[PDB]
């Protein structure tokens, strides 16, 4: 189950092929057997190539197997295929007898052709293609038309008089070029799976009838395998062309009965299960763009499609792009709390994890925005930049420092509720998301309100705390881009840690915080702004 690879791969004889299978990057899977085996109706994998060196006697020179522990991958290259290789296979690790493995299907077919009267034509679905067909010199004013031989009979797709197949109507044009050129072309729009077949040219009604038999293949996209862990994040790169820039975009996910369910639209539509944890970047010069999904769940694995349509949904004959997704479930992403509850006027504290190796990056923090094509601007970083609207009540900090840091946000309000993302400058990119709910009550900390003061004296401001904060150390700090630093020797029994300012200048202007420590973790704080008068 924790192994991942491509389900079915097709090629034709004489060609090479290269298969990639994925494993979690743990120590053993970076340092133990990988294999490619073949089963049958006889009960057992027969090993064909191994990571330990052994190659089957029938596969000497044919194939080899390589492991990239850094990618968490091992690769299988097969060349010189034949029709005797089509069957059921499995990638896997460790002892063949167990199933730390993944099943693969393989179908090999002969290289067709031999027909000089018909060439190959493989194109993409929903795209445009055109067929060029010659006529002899006597084909001046003579019927120019194509015919699709479907089973028993040939039917017509475009005439020389304006008729067109109602299955195909409006997607087609006939061109006979001037300059004494003796060919013609047929252009088709909205390429569909219901279009693949064998055509036939014609040049006129007469006995001449310069026919040209033709094929029509349509290239569905080969799926791409994506490997992400549980409670992790993923970035998809959709790569449509500039030819659908005006047209909207979409993203669906495959389901049972050939039915995408949409997850987000250029029309602002969005799946309710994926509310919050989805982003969408603006489109590029080529219309290229990317979709960021965070906090993936066990049912989120599967095939994904991104496209471009007027309705921003699935239809027959529209350009698409595919992905195949896998969720690990043998994950290393630490389970962090997802929902964090606060009260109006209260505080919140959020623990944000990241990969331990890139601890010297620049943490960021962004707010998700709906009612849009989805947006998420920054709010704070680790150098100390902060959004201009939140001076005083917000700071982040690297106290735990082992891939985990803490964020403290006090003076909570019910208007602030929503979803928050955590970012990093590292190449690996977790985007852990936490939701803030607001409930009823008053915060545990008690501090007087916003107060003015005279210049140049001694002033004291109190902060009592409840009995549940009685087992900690208590402190005051001065808020700034640097955050907190406590002021040692302001205390009582389990209440009333009080700030005292011996002498004061207006350089001490600003917000101050009163808070408690959890040994090496942080807790509730509260804030008060102080002015200076004279």
């Amino acid at each position: 189950s924790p192994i991942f690879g491509p389900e079915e791969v097709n090629s034709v004889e004489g060609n090479s092929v290269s298969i990639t299978c994925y494993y979690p990057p743990t120590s053993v899977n970076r340092h133990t057997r990988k294999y490619w085996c073949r089963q049958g109706a006889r009960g057992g994998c027969i090993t064909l190539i191994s990571s330990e060196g052994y190659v089957s006697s029938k596969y000497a020179g044919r194939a080899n197997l390589t492991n990239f522990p850094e990618n968490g991958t091992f690769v299988v290259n097969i060349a010189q295929l034949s029709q005797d290789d089509s069957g059921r296979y499995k990638c896997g690790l460790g002892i063949n007898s167990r199933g730390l493995s993944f099943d693969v299907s393989l179908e090999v077919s002969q290289g067709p052709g031999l027909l000089n009267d018909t060439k190959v034509y493989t194109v993409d679905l929903g795209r445009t293609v055109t067929i060029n067909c010659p006529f002899k010199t006597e084909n001046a004013q003579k019927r120019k038309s194509l015919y699709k031989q479907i089973g028993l009979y040939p039917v017509l797709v475009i005439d020389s008089s304006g008729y067109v197949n109602p299955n195909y109507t409006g997607r087609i044009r006939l061109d006979i070029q001037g300059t004494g050129q003796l060919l013609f072309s047929v252009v088709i729009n909205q390429l569909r799976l219901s279009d693949a077949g064998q055509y036939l040219c014609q040049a006129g009604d007469d006995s001449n009838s310069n026919k040209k038999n033709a094929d029509l293949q349509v290239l569905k996209p080969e799926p791409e395998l994506v490997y992400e862990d549980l409670r992790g994040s993923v970035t998809f790169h959709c790569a449509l062309g500039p030819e659908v820039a005006n047209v909207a975009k979409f993203l669906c996910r495959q389901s049972s009965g050939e039915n995408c369910d949409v997850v987000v639209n250029t029309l602002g539509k969005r799946a309710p299960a994926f509310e919050g944890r989805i982003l969408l970047n603006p489109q590029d010069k080529d219309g290229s763009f990317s979709v960021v999904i965070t906090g993936l769940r066990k049912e989120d694995a599967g095939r994904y499609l991104c496209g471009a349509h007027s309705d921003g949904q699935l239809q027959e004959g529209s350009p698409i792009q595919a992905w195949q997704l896998f969720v690990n479930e043998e994950s290393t992403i630490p389970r962090s709390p997802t929902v964090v509850k606060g009260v109006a006027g209260g505080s919140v504290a959020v623990l944000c994890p990241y990969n331990r190796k890139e601890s010297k990056s620049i943490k960021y923090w962004c707010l998700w925005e709906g009612a849009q094509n989805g947006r998420c601007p920054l709010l704070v970083d680790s150098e100390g930049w902060v959004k201009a609207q939140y001076e005083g009540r917000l700071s982040l900090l690297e106290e735990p420092g082992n891939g985990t840091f803490t964020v403290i946000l006090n003076q909570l309000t019910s208007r602030d509720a929503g979803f928050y993302w955590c970012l990093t400058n590292g190449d690996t990119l977790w985007r852990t998301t936490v939701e803030i709910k607001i409930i009823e009550g008053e915060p545990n900390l008690k501090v007087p309100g916003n107060v003015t003061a005279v210049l140049g004296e001694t002033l004291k401001v109190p902060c009592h705390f409840p009995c549940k904060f009685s087992s900690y150390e208590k402190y005051w700090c001065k808020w700034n881009n640097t955050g907190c630093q406590a002021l040692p020797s302001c205390d009582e029994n389990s209440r009333l840690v009080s700030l005292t300012l011996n002498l004061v200048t207006r350089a001490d202007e600003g917000w101050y915080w009163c808070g408690v420590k959890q040994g090496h973790f942080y807790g509730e704080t509260a804030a008060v702004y102080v002015a200076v008068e004279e």
Partner: protein, 123 residues
């Protein structure tokens, strides 16, 4: 604390899905109990709470009860209806336990021992 499921014959009238949470042999009284359903406390009237009447055979210990009903049609989603006890004499002062349909007792086993030298591994 235990959490007994309804009776099988209860589950043939096809309306009343009784559920029983409980508490046994403890000192002292004043204990508080409540039922939690997916991190969401139930309706306080939905259940009914006992009072800590004393033990029969124990020297002086206490015990109480609480019962709750739901649609037996609901006893197909289940969601294990976690009953949150709240007693002072607990390491974190809460000893939650919960029970659902899938919990309890099955009457269809299928043990499946295997046997091999290819072991000592536990994949």
């Amino acid at each position: 604390v235990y959490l007994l499921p309804p009776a099988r014959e209860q589950l043939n009238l096809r309306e009343s899905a009784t559920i029983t949470c409980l508490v046994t042999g403890f000192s002292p009284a004043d204990v508080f109990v409540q039922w939690m359903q997916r991190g969401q406390p139930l309706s306080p009237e939905k259940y009914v709470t006992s009072a800590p009447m004393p033990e029969p055979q124990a020297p002086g210990r206490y015990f109480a009860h609480s019962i709750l009903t739901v649609s037996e049609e609901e006893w197909n989603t289940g969601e294990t209806y976690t009953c949150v006890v709240a007693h002072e004499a607990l390491p974190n002062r809460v000893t939650e336990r919960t029970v659902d349909k899938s919990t309890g007792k099955p009457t269809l086993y299928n043990v499946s021992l295997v046997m091999s030298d290819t072991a000592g591994t536990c994949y």
